Symmetry: C3
Subunit: 125 residues, 3 copies
């Protein structure tokens, strides 16, 4: 076994996606992973990512929903803003593909949070 | 979709709660989430939080238990010590509500760990 | 309940292990936890660790696999390199015990990533 130190950290991102339309359980974690590979394939990047399941509670009223935590590592060796741009594009497309009111995107470097973007739908009301 | 940068990080906390009394599986993750909303409701804060399931191994002997990872974000915009105080209150009440011998509380800012508090029961022996 | 501040963080590590041989689902999360206690028992360290389940997607072709996230805390109070050495030994042995092509090892301190080691099999080809 060859042990190689890839570095001190690098850029990573985390995307949180709910599975409810309003308050109805609708999508599964398998829906989000299959749709995440498809989006990043069209981006040209390697769609390599991992997914963690979560239980969520949020508020207007209080809903309990299942959510999915998406972890992306900057494997293709991009700059921070080319990497941030595609993650934000993935989050924006993920919010539409699952009719979410909001999607959180959090960019990290060596585990330290650099930015946390809010992707909110502008539904007319 | 409106993309707004909420900031560079903020304060967050993580609470780890076991599900065993001594060595007997007793509680589920649904027990911890329902009891976590109830506590933070009485605190006045928005009870918004997410929950991740875990498998645990700890030591006196070695027990394997299911545990729950609770993630709290400082959404209400508190100072670090008003936020830390309520998390520590939530952890202290969670340890009693599930008869835990110990509960770990870890405060973060932008993902960097600031403090890790130990909440241990003082059972007479 | 006695609340004691253990410190500002400490050393922690994360080990990611897949469950597929090539592309066939083979092992479960229970296989990895039982084998992780056994290895760290032989290391002399307290085998205390937690385990999180994951869904994985990686690329040569694209495979979808279940994986396990192993979280280790420096409870025994070692130096960074005695702690790093045993984690790397655990990762190296874990890669063999489950016939993995690669295993990622990531050392943290107070949540900040210090090193990310790659443990790759040198299969002759």
């Amino acid at each position: 076994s060859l042990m190689e130190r890839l570095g001190g950290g690098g850029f990573s991102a985390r995307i949180f996606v709910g599975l409810n339309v309003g308050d109805k359980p609708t999508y599964t974690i398998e829906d989000v992973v299959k749709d995440t590979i498809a989006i990043r394939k069209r981006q040209g990047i390697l769609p390599d990512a991992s997914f963690v399941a979560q239980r969520g509670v949020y508020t207007g009223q209080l809903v309990t929903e299942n959510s999915v935590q998406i972890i992306i590592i900057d494997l293709e060796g991009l700059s921070k803003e080319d990497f941030t741009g595609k993650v934000q594009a993935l989050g924006k497309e993920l919010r539409e593909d699952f009719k979410q009111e909001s999607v959180i995107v959090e960019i990290q470097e060596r585990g330290i949070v650099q930015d946390v973007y809010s992707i909110t739908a502008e539904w007319y009301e």
